[PDB]
Ligand SMILES: Nc1nc2c(ncn2[C@@H]2O[C@H](COP(=O)(O)OP(=O)(O)O)[C@@H](O)[C@H]2O)c(=O)[nH]1
Ligand SMILES: Nc1nc2c(ncn2[C@@H]2O[C@H](COP(=O)(O)OP(=O)(O)O)[C@@H](O)[C@H]2O)c(=O)[nH]1
Ligand SMILES: [Ca+2]
């Protein structure tokens with residue numbers, strides 16, 4: 001009994017256990033045995049095997065449901081029947097998941113983005129619910145480990161807990177869970193597809209590949225000619241000098257004030273932050289990318305749906321950078337731009353730049369500088385996030 005074979009079957013069992021209760025009920029048994037073969041046998045002829053398990057082992061059937069040990073036992077009983085099941089779940093002759101299963105072909109045209117379609121979100125909603133055993137709409141570390149049992153490695157670093165919404169204890173909430181998949185689909189779609197394969201998405205939803213979960217948006221250029229978009233996820237690059245408050249902006253989207261932010265650790269620090277934002281009654285995803293001050297602004301880190309140029313009102317040299325980067329990359333750009341006067345809770349000093357932030361915005365047809373602070377008693381104001389998303393949806397309005 002090769003250890004590798006048992007590992008595959010255990011994962012197959014875990015995937016086939018769709019309600020995640022520990023056993024395979026007859027509904028799940030019919031489904032598995034249908035997709036692997038052809039026709040679910042007589043409901044009584046099903047126990048013509050379900051009692052066979054009962055009279056060899058005493059832990060193979062629990063509450064009229066086939067257990068893992070029973071599942072593994074039935075594998076032993078057969079030994080081609082096994083390889084049919086294995087190949088149906090995407091394994092090859094070396095008991096590894098095939099590249100065709102994990103990495104399906106999904107090529108995205110330039111200036112297009114990737115989102116999860118409606119049914120894909122539903123799968124993740126179901127997935128979340130099956131692993132939320134205490135029913136608190138949040139995934140504890142133990143519940144997360146349970147989820148990752150069908151993963152060859154841990155798919156999420158502990159920095160994810162500051163990229164999306166979490167509860168009091170810092171556990172990924174229901175919306176934070178969806179936000180993380182939304183973010184992953186956007187940035188690294190082939191990683192998302194690989195993870196969907198691990199969850200057995202294509203198998204359970206009975207589709208051609210994992211790529212069937214991904215919606216590929218149209219060219220951004222067309223969105224600007226038509227002057228309207230159908231995208232639900234927009235990316236905003238957050239640019240500003242060192243310690244100007246960029247990270248504070250990202251965590252403010254997650255509803256965390258400066259007090260709450262101070263408890264973030266070693267490698268907790270994320271440079272992305274995503275959450276739902278409502279624009280005129282329309283629910284959209286806002287995707288913030290923290291651009292740490294570097295020697296260069298590449299084409300890579302200046303491409304977005306809206307730019308957030310942040311400066312520090314307590315720093316007299318901070319705004320000069322915003323003006324510099326703007327003239328350099330976004331002055332004659334189709335990309336909307338918003339200037340944010342961060343740390344507004346601090347005393348406002350004079351910016352050493354020749355022109356004032358107000359006059360600068362007035363001169364270049366920008367909105368007036370938006371005052372912002374994350375140092376508040378409760379959750380910070382989400383005003384700038386609503387404005388950023390609005391500008392991303394409706395550029396020149
Ligand atoms: N690891 C890493 N550090 C970087 C990178 N780019 C810039 N930094 C450093 O990050 C610091 C500036 O970050 P800052 O602008 O304050 O934004 P923050 O990352 O949110 O703190 C400087 O010490 C940079 O050298 C990068 O790609 N990787
Ligand atoms: N008073 C005040 N301090 C802030 C605010 N936001 C950030 N800070 C402090 O400013 C420093 C830099 O903030 P951070 O978000 O790390 O900036 P970044 O390095 O540019 O991303 C930290 O010491 C923060 O505690 C704010 O709204 N008010
Ligand atoms: Ca079950």
Ligand SMILES: [Ca+2]
Nearest residue numbers: 132138139140
């Ligand atoms: Ca839970």
Ligand SMILES: [Mg+2]
Nearest residue numbers: 242243244247
């Ligand atoms: Mg910094």
